[PDB]
Amino acid sequence: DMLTLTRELTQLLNSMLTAIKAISSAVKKLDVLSNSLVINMLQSSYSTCVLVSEENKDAIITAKEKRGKYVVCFDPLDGASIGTIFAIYEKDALQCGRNIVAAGYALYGSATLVALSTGQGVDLFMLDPALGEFVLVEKDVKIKKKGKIYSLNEGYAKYFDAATTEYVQKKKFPEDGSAPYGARYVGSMVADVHRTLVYGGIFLYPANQKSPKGKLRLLYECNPVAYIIEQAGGLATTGTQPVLDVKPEAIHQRVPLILGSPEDVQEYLTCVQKN
Amino acid sequence: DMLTLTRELTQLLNSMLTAIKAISSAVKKLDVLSNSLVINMLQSSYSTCVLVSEENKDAIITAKEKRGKYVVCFDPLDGASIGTIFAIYEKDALQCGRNIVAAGYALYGSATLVALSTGQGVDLFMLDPALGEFVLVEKDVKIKKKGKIYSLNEGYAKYFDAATTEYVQKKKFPEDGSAPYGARYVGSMVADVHRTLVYGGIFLYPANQKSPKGKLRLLYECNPVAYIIEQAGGLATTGTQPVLDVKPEAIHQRVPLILGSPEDVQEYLTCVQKN
Amino acid sequence: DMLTLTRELTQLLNSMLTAIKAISSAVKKLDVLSNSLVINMLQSSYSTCVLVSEENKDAIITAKEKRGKYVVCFDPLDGASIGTIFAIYEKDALQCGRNIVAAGYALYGSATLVALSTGQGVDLFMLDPALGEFVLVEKDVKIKKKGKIYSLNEGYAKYFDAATTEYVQKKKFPEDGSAPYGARYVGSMVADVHRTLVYGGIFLYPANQKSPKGKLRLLYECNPVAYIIEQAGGLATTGTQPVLDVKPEAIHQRVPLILGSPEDVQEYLTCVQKN
Amino acid sequence: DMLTLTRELTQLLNSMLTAIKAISSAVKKLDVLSNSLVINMLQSSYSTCVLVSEENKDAIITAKEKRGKYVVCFDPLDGASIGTIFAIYEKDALQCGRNIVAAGYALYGSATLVALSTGQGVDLFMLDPALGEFVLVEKDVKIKKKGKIYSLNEGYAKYFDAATTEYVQKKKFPEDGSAPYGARYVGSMVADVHRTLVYGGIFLYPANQKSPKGKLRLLYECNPVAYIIEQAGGLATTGTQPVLDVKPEAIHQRVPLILGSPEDVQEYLTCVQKN
Ligand SMILES: O=P(O)(O)OC[C@H]1O[C@](O)(COP(=O)(O)O)[C@@H](O)[C@@H]1O
Ligand SMILES: O=P(O)(O)OC[C@H]1O[C@](O)(COP(=O)(O)O)[C@@H](O)[C@@H]1O
Ligand SMILES: O=P(O)(O)OC[C@H]1O[C@](O)(COP(=O)(O)O)[C@@H](O)[C@@H]1O
Ligand SMILES: O=P(O)(O)OC[C@H]1O[C@](O)(COP(=O)(O)O)[C@@H](O)[C@@H]1O
Numbered sequence A, B, C, D: 001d002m003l004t005l006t007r008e009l010t011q012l013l014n015s016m017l018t019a020i021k022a023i024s025s026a027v028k029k030l031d032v033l034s035n036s037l038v039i040n041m042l043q044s045s046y047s048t049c050v051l052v053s054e055e056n057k058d059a060i061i062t063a064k065e066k067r068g069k070y071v072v073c074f075d076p077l078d079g080a081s082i083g084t085i086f087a088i089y090e091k092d093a094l095q096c097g098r099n100i101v102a103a104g105y106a107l108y109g110s111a112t113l114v115a116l117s118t119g120q121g122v123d124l125f126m127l128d129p130a131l132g133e134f135v136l137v138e139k140d141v142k143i144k145k146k147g148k149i150y151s152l153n154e155g156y157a158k159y160f161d162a163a164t165t166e167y168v169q170k171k172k173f174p175e176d177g178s179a180p181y182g183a184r185y186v187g188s189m190v191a192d193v194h195r196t197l198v199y200g201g202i203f204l205y206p207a208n209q210k211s212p213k214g215k216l217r218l219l220y221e222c223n224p225v226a227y228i229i230e231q232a233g234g235l236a237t238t239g240t241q242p243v244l245d246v247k248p249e250a251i252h253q254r255v256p257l258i259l260g261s262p263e264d265v266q267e268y269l270t271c272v273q274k275n
Helices: A009-026 A029-042 A154-159 A162-172 A189-199 A218-231 A262-273 B009-026 B029-042 B154-159 B162-172 B189-199 B218-231 B262-273 C009-026 C029-042 C154-159 C162-172 C189-199 C218-231 C262-273 D009-026 D029-042 D154-159 D162-172 D189-199 D218-231 D262-273
Strands: A002-006 A048-053 A070-078 A082-088 A102-108 A112-117 A123-128 A133-138 A149-151 A202-205 A235-237 A257-260 B002-006 B048-053 B067-078 B082-088 B102-108 B112-117 B123-128 B133-138 B149-151 B202-205 B235-237 B257-260 C002-006 C048-053 C070-078 C082-088 C102-108 C112-117 C123-128 C133-138 C149-151 C202-205 C235-237 C257-260 D002-006 D048-053 D067-078 D082-088 D102-108 D112-117 D123-128 D133-138 D149-151 D202-205 D235-237 D257-260
Touching: A009 A029, A009 A070, A009 A082, A009 A102, A009 A112, A009 A123, A029 A048, A029 A070, A029 A082, A048 A218, A070 A218, A082 A189, A082 A218, A102 A189, A102 A218, A112 A189, A112 A218, A149 A189, A154 A162, A154 B162, A162 A262, A162 B154, A189 A202, A189 A218, A189 A257, A202 A262, A218 A235, A218 A257, A235 A262, A257 A262, B009 B029, B009 B067, B009 B082, B009 B102, B009 B112, B009 B123, B029 B048, B029 B067, B029 B082, B048 B218, B067 B218, B082 B189, B082 B218, B102 B189, B102 B218, B112 B189, B112 B218, B149 B189, B154 B162, B162 B262, B189 B202, B189 B218, B189 B257, B202 B262, B218 B235, B218 B257, B235 B262, B257 B262, C009 C029, C009 C070, C009 C082, C009 C102, C009 C112, C009 C123, C029 C048, C029 C070, C029 C082, C048 C218, C070 C218, C082 C189, C082 C218, C102 C189, C102 C218, C112 C189, C112 C218, C149 C189, C154 C162, C154 D162, C162 C262, C162 D154, C189 C202, C189 C218, C189 C257, C202 C262, C218 C235, C218 C257, C235 C262, C257 C262, D009 D029, D009 D067, D009 D082, D009 D102, D009 D112, D009 D123, D029 D048, D029 D067, D029 D082, D048 D218, D067 D218, D082 D189, D082 D218, D102 D189, D102 D218, D112 D189, D112 D218, D149 D189, D154 D162, D162 D262, D189 D202, D189 D218, D189 D257, D202 D262, D218 D235, D218 D257, D235 D262, D257 D262
Parallel strands: A002 D133, A048 A070, A133 D002, A149 A202, B002 C133, B048 B067, B133 C002, B149 B202, C048 C070, C149 C202, D048 D067, D149 D202
Antiparallel strands: A002 D002, A070 A082, A082 A102, A102 A112, A112 A123, A123 A133, A202 A257, A235 A257, B002 C002, B067 B082, B082 B102, B102 B112, B112 B123, B123 B133, B202 B257, B235 B257, C070 C082, C082 C102, C102 C112, C112 C123, C123 C133, C202 C257, C235 C257, D067 D082, D082 D102, D102 D112, D112 D123, D123 D133, D202 D257, D235 D257
16 A cells, blocks of 8 residues: 656656646636646747647747747647647648657546657556646557447438448448447547547548538647557548648648547448448 | 535435545445445445345345435446436335435546435536535536437447337438437446436437347436436436336336437437337 | 535735645745745736735836736745745835735645635635635634743743743743643744634744844734734734834844734733833 | 556555545544544454554454454544554553554644654655555655754643753753754644654653653554654653653553654753753
């Protein structure tokens, strides 16, 4: 019942974590609050030059007094089961996801949880609010090759393209005498993606008739989780190419998102190719 | 930035709340732990004679030393977004839901939340862990007449009966030029029911081919939430009769559960009648 | 086991309280940290023009962008049993204590406690960290007419003046067949003063040979607690005049402090007069 | 900003710690509450046969169902700055302190702190309430050879024996041109002893005219802290022999307590010998 504790890009990550700490205890003026917490704590790290936020139309240039080498694209507050999303890399904020040096998300649940990766796999952390610090609870998290959960808003079935319609059909009526997958959809991305990571399976927000480029945002929603998910041995596709290979044409560009267990995503891609 | 605090069946409810407090900070040996916490704190209130638990095969008779007039059926730990469910009333534990004097649930999220009702509407509470007490955050909660969210596991589509198949079809393809409903399904009952209460709409765990009597348990899952939901102006049906009117034929009896906004549930019932 | 919560100078006090909240969870770079927390949260209230801090040589003038009518003298971190002290009123910071509109202290113990007064008695509050707000636990706190505790550093006995020597002698060897007083001295002012308020008795940091003007600071140590203590029905003297009547001749001026139950302080004054 | 955690007598200590956890968040029916928390958690460890409590007249024999090899003498709640004290070893509870296998105290401050020793020095712990576990913050704590603080209730000066009178005189008026010691006396033993450990110096509750055997209790006040203090390189005497060498003649026997920096206690003993 007794324990011991053991401990510029590093600088940046500690500040993002501190903002996540702050955001956590504060959990729509809340959107505003959490937004400025990130902006300001990020701008005190002396390691940023350009920030991209889901809450600001244009990129936020760090004054040279406090300027450093990294670029941070974030969604300060996404969605209980609310989240924060970020990736570290105005032209400097339009890099494809493959240039990501670091990224992660926090999920504000019964406990505040952080998935983090700097290119050598994914680590899961838990905010110890008493200590005011993040505790490692799992190293190098790896996703199942194949799961049994599919996760999308089926209320858009009327707007689905053929591939999505087909893939969902295969999940409910496997033509191979196997059990249908279970369905789960919280409707908060961080929460659905995090379940997908630890339990396995697939999460989709594809293009549909009413959102032809999907809903979720490339720079600070899709690219970050795609990075996390791939570092855990999964896949993240738009349906036509890996999310991390999209070349951003605007900082609030949307893309389709399909990610998860690699064999599930590969099954989806098969449905797309064969139309 | 300053506040003032203001304050036998009552006895029973404080003990259930205390167990919920304990359960909350402890959040599969966890199932065992939470179970005994309820049993023992309930048996110290000197107000129970018969307990029914999701974790115990048979009813748990209170010794006469500590015996009182009420009967408690509970699910100590259901399912982040885990919950606890209870209703207050061995033959003494097989009453139909209409004899309920009190019931509620807790949802262990970013905050621990309790929906409670003693027959005069529903009150929402928040556990103040610092104070170690529950704070009123909303009185007489009322559900929307009609919502725009439907919530069920569609991975069972292959096992759905005709009415369910039909109703889900109507939600995606409204034949009235209205928008399709949105879908949400966390897969934890307390979490799905609680969303249904505050946002409106409908939650279904109907009978299907593989679970012909549904999955959820009458005494300490379905009856409790049916009570909460009706006290908030909603409906809770098995498809053929109000949940609270089922006459229990066994303490772990299952029933179908459809509940929520009354006009949504009434639409469902229409689909059942007309088959 | 259930509760309800009920709710420009007001603005200023909420910000001081917020800084006390922040200081509380952060509890010598700590001195620096707590200092800036007060300064900055006070300067965001748009209600200050001049701040005086124990940590800054000179007064801190609020820019006109954020300027308001009140002056705040504070000790951000005094001294477990650490505290924060403040009074609300550069010439504008050299007012005698009688111009005080509001003052108080926080004591960071097992719980964070605030004694507060705006001229109509003293109220005691407890920081509810979960709620992030201060809860009233006692209104109009009144001190005993006479106590049985005396509190000073007797390790300075060799430096005491005659009156102090005499008074301490009378406490140990009452010449009236009454019990000697008990002694208590934590060595943190907020902690010793707070005990004096709730239990009664007397607290002394008189002049001595090595500190001829006493040790404690008039503007943000002595004046504040003198205000609190008098609003609770006590006295606060330098030995020659009420603390709140001293005319400040410098912002870090020291004065002797004797305060507490009025009959105890009056006994002390008798010892001074008769030398 | 990220951390990793690393982990029958052992059994007993974890349960004592758990009770300290419980006691901590509950911080005179409080005396009663904390008492039963210790008794019951100690009796669930299956490692005790005889308990001695400050709150129970007679020793508390563990039923054989749950009987083990160790004996625990404790003060569940002593005295903010409240504490809990215990030593591990009815005849089985009257052993001299030298048979102690383990002992410690908790101090319930701004943080809950535990000093612990099992014969190989003293370790300091901090309760991490979030983790619900105790974190090591300092290993093998060692006390100063000599301090500059003396700590006793001088309101008993009229009842002091000659040695105490003399020693206190030497502290205020050093006959060697050295500074007088500072005085500190919180009046809660755990708090005064803990300050003595980390800052150095001496703490006294000697015999006086009105308490000829001192006030503090041998089995669960004096023996425990004497053990802690000696394991940190200090001394603990009654004035005539080491506390840990007293042979208990009753389970609520009192003894004088003088402890702290060894050279300070040795100075005191000199004053006793030479009368
Ligand atoms: O209700 P829908 O259409 O299923 O969309 C839910 C999605 O929208 C989101 O709330 C994101 O919206 P934003 O892009 O505005 O931040 C995600 O968290 C979630 O996956
Ligand atoms: O995965 P499914 O089949 O959708 O079922 C999920 C349901 O099962 C539950 O976990 C209840 O299961 P239990 O009856 O064993 O407690 C509910 O919380 C939830 O609504
Ligand atoms: O050790 P001493 O001389 O008794 O002084 C203790 C006093 O000094 C203080 O720590 C204040 O010191 P500062 O004036 O530097 O803030 C008080 O809290 C306390 O009453
Ligand atoms: O007021 P006094 O006479 O100085 O005594 C204070 C002492 O009494 C105590 O409160 C202990 O009393 P108990 O023996 O009844 O537990 C100690 O914590 C403290 O050191």
